[PDB]
Amino acid sequence: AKTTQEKFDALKEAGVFSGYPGTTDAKLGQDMTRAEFAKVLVKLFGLKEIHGQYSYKDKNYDAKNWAAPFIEAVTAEGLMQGKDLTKKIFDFNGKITVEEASKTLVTALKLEPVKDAQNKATDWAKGYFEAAVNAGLFSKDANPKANATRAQLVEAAFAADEMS
Ligand SMILES: [Cl-]
Ligand SMILES: [Cl-]
């Protein structure tokens, strides 16, 4: 049984997660931005970065934003969409949620959302969260609406990698 720390160390070795300067602390209790999570997905699934395309209207979403090539890759791949679709806002500094991460991973693994799933997720996500739980990516007792912890994302990424 690998611990969350051992799963993180393996993912860091692989270039999927990064740690922090000066310490071996992986901050497993802390949160992750949507920009960072798009980079995680690009590394985890070996996606091509997309330069010189900008699908969203967020302020400071341009060539000087380090995250755009990753955000564009997960967008073209169908993994992430904006937080709001009429204004085309990605919310790159916003934190990724359990249920958002669930939808990305379920889609990337070509799994099927569960129809008429009953759980605490936002309506759009109930099926994705349920599919993610059933695949072992998140615990049934996780809060789907919460910001996902780095621990949770490590576990989910690790499991997804094994399924691929
Ligand atoms: Cl921590
Ligand atoms: Cl969990």
Author numbering: 28 to 191
Task: Reproduce passages from the article.
Prokaryotic cell envelopes often include proteinaceous surface (S-) layers composed of self-assembling subunits in porous two-dimensional crystalline lattices. S-layer anchoring is best characterized for Gram-positive bacteria, where S-layer proteins non-covalently attach to the PG layer via species- and strain-specific non-classical secondary cell wall polymers (SCWPs). SpaA possesses three consecutive SLH domains near its N-terminus, followed by a large C-terminal region presumed to harbor the self-assembling domain(s). The crystal structures and binding analyses presented here of P. alvei SpaASLH, SpaASLH/G109A, and SpaASLH/G46A/G109A with synthetic SCWP fragments provide novel insights into the functional contributions of many conserved SLH domain residues, including SLH-Trp13, SLH-Gly29, and SLH-Arg43, which precisely interlock from three different SLH domains to generate two active binding sites.
